[PDB]
Amino acid sequence: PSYVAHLASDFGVRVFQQVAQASKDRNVVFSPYGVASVLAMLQLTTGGETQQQIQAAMGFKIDDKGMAPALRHLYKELMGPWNKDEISTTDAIFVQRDLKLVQGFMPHFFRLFRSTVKQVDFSEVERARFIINDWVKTHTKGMISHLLGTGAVQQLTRLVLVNALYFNGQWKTPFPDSSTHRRLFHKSDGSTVSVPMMAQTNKFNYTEFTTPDGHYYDILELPYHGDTLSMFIAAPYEKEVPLSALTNILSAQLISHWKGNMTRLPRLLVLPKFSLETEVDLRKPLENLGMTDMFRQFQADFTSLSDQEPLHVALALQKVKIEVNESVIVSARMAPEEIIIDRPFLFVVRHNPTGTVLFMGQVMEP
Ligand SMILES: O=C(O)c1cc(O)c(O)c(O)c1
């Protein structure tokens, strides 16, 4: 029954692979969970071939027994009392106000998701961008408030989807503030830059990992408070190893494979702070997974939502912000060995009780 979290996580991972491919040495943060969530919602508005494509890529039909309840249960678990403003997430779909909608579709949307498709009059362009940005502002407790991509909303815009998340976790064990210091970080083009790094020593759940194609990485787990979430960090051990070899095989099963081989060893960990924001225009990544009809103004099929339509998605966005920070004279217990994360690495944030992949990223330069 944690089955939908797996499928939703894997779909969102494949979307992240496509976006990583398009940004070679650029920082990127992303939510596998968020894109699956907004796309599971989009599913209900579609019919015919557009629907087939999305169900093929996602691996499940939203209408199917127990799929939506499960998603709902997961969202409610994410927003529960454990979460001290650590995570905000919002999904939304905006359709043009005028439209003759399919009878009984809006309520049925409400039954399955407990939220509504919004109606905006897109002919008041200036008003329509404000409404969208303010939605995202009000549902992320003000942490996210502008989407660049809304610059593209025009008079002819009829359907827009949006997803936004902010993450900033409390560590189970906080890094000591006095330990933070400037350290050399090696960038992928060979140059260096000085950056703040945190240090902590204790028993870290650790394993070495080899991809089937012979690429090596160090894998660390960092538990957040109460063990609800964890960050997995994956970093090459030499400088010429690409993150892609790892990213291109990434899955939920892959994390649980890490977890099964890990062991808690005493280590000094030195890790850069970072606060990163990414805005993704989802159309290429999604077309790349075969969801091409939805974006084409005649091939597109949203007849589950409206028959009075040429209806198609004019804008699909994800925006994400993630912060990893800590929460004189300076002392520590010595450890048999040191793990210095001074080269590009990937990270995964997971929801431990379901296995959901809430966030992933490659940090090329912090
Ligand atoms: O359908 C969701 O899970 C969702 C619901 C909301 O009410 C919301 O504000 C959001 O940003 C996402």
Curated annotation (Swiss-Prot):
Single GO BP term: negative regulation of endothelial cell apoptotic process
Pfam families, per database record: Serpin
Tissue: Expressed in endothelial cells. Found in plasma, platelets, and hepatoma and fibrosarcoma cells.
Keyword Signal appears in the UniProt entry: yes
Subcellular location: Secreted
Induction: Up-regulated by coagulation factor Xa (F10) in atrial tissues. Up-regulated in atrial tissues by rapid pacing resembling atrial fibrillation.
Residues with attached carbohydrate: N205, N261, N325
Marked site: Reactive bond: R333, M334
Complex formation: Forms a heterodimer with TMPRSS7. Interacts with VTN. Binds LRP1B; binding is followed by internalization and degradation. Interacts with PPP1CB. In complex with PLAU/uPA, interacts with PLAUR/uPAR. Interacts with SORL1 and LRP1, either alone or in complex with PLAU; these interactions are abolished in the presence of LRPAP1/RAP. The ternary complex composed of PLAUR-PLAU-PAI1 also interacts with SORL1. Interacts with PLAT/tPA. Also interacts with SORL1, when complexed to PLAT/tPA.
Physiological role: Serine protease inhibitor. Inhibits TMPRSS7. Is a primary inhibitor of tissue-type plasminogen activator (PLAT) and urokinase-type plasminogen activator (PLAU). As PLAT inhibitor, it is required for fibrinolysis down-regulation and is responsible for the controlled degradation of blood clots. As PLAU inhibitor, it is involved in the regulation of cell adhesion and spreading. Acts as a regulator of cell migration, independently of its role as protease inhibitor. It is required for stimulation of keratinocyte migration during cutaneous injury repair.
Annotated disorder: Plasminogen activator inhibitor-1 deficiency: A hematologic disorder characterized by increased bleeding after trauma, injury, or surgery. Affected females have menorrhagia. The bleeding defect is due to increased fibrinolysis of fibrin blood clots due to deficiency of plasminogen activator inhibitor-1, which inhibits tissue and urinary activators of plasminogen.
Protein family per UniProt: Belongs to the serpin family.
Protein name: Plasminogen activator inhibitor 1
Gene name of the encoded protein: SERPINE1
